[PDB]
Amino acid sequence: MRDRLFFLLSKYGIRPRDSIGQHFLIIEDVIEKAIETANVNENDVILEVGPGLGFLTDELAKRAKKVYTIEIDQKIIEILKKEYSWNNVKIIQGDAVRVEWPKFNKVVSNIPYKISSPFTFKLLKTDFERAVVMYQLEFALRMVAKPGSRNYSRLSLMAQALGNVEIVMKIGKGAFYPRPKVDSALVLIEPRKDKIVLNENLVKALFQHRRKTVPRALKDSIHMLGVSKDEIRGIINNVPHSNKRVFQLYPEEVKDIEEYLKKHGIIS
Ligand SMILES: CSC[C@H]1O[C@@H](n2cnc3c(N)ncnc32)[C@H](O)[C@@H]1O
Ligand SMILES: O=S([O-])[O-]
Numbered sequence: 001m002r003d004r005l006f007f008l009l010s011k012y013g014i015r016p017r018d019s020i021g022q023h024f025l026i027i028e029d030v031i032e033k034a035i036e037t038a039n040v041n042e043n044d045v046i047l048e049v050g051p052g053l054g055f056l057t058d059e060l061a062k063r064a065k066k067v068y069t070i071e072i073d074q075k076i077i078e079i080l081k082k083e084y085s086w087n088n089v090k091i092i093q094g095d096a097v098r099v100e101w102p103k104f105n106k107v108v109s110n111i112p113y114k115i116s117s118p119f120t121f122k123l124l125k126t127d128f129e130r131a132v133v134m135y136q137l138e139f140a141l142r143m144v145a146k147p148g149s150r151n152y153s154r155l156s157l158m159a160q161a162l163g164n165v166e167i168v169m170k171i172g173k174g175a176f177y178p179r180p181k182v183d184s185a186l187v188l189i190e191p192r193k194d195k196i197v198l199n200e201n202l203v204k205a206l207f208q209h210r211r212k213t214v215p216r217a218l219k220d221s222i223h224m225l226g227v228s229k230d231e232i233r234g235i236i237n238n239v240p241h242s243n244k245r246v247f248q249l250y251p252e253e254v255k256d257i258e259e260y261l262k263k264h265g266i267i268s
C-alpha cells in the first residue's frame, strides 16, 4: 500500500507534498479501523477532506450511501477521476476551510495537519452525528484538555462546549508517507446533546491571552474595539467568575460572562 502510493506518484510524475503538514495514511488496518469506529453503513452520507490518492475514499465509497470529498489540488482530482470508478462519490475542489460544506451525517477523514484547528472549529458548528478524524497526537491531546490544564485553549473549550471527544487510539508515525516527526491520533467526536453555544467574539477575546484573569482580559479586548476604559471598568469589575484566569473556565462559566455582558449592553 506504500508500494501502491509510490506507483501512483511515479505514474503521474508528482511529488508527495506541496506543503509541510501533509502525510498520506498507508496502513489498510488504520483505514478499516477509522471506518469501523465511525459505523459506516449503506445509509450514511460521509464528508472526507484531503482524499489524497483515494485510499480512505475508496473504502468509504464501498460502504456509504454517498461520499463528498473536498480536495484543494486540481492535479489530485484529475488522478482520482482516472484511477477510480465510483458511482457514489462527489469530489469538491476547494480549501475545505473556505468552501460550503455539503449536508452529511458523518465525517471519516485524515485531516491535513495545517488545517487541524480551522477544520475542527468549523465541524463543531455543524449538524453531524459522528466524526472520526486523524490529527497529530499533540493536537488531539489539546482537544481533550480539561479546564485549568496547561494546554487548555480556545480549541479545548469549544470541543467540550459543543462535542464529546475521545481519542480512540494513538497512530504510529510508521503509518504515513512521508513519516511524520510525531504520532497521530484517531479521534471520535459526537455533538453534545446539551450544547453550550458561546459567542465566538467573546471566546476569541478571552483566549487571545488565556493567561490573564477574566477582568484583565475583558478590559483589554473591549478597549481594543474602540471603547473608553472608564466606560467599561465598573460593569467588568462585577463580571462572574472574576477570580479565574481565562484558561480555567468551563464552557458554563463563559456562558454566564456572555449573559452578563449581553444584559449590560456590551455584546448584542
Ligand atoms: C490528507 S493529507 C494530504 C491531502 O490533503 C489535500 N489538502 C491539503 N490541504 C487541503 C485543504 N485545505 N482542503 C482540502 N484538501 C486539502 C492535499 O491536496 C492532499 O491530497
Ligand atoms: O508509538 S509512537 O511512540 O511511535
Ligand SMILES: O=S([O-])[O-]
Pocket: 020, 021, 022, 023, 113, 179, 180, 181, 182
Ligand atoms: O510534517 S508533519 O510532521 O506535520
Ligand SMILES: [Zn+2]
Pocket: 058, 084, 085
Ligand atoms: Zn475501487
Ligand SMILES: [Zn+2]
Pocket: 138
Ligand atoms: Zn507543542
Ligand SMILES: [Zn+2]
Pocket: 166, 188
Ligand atoms: Zn469509543
Ligand SMILES: [Zn+2]
Pocket: 223
Ligand atoms: Zn488605551
Ligand SMILES: [Zn+2]
Pocket: 240, 241, 244, 253
Ligand atoms: Zn466560577
Ligand SMILES: [Zn+2]
Pocket: 252, 253, 256
Ligand atoms: Zn453558572
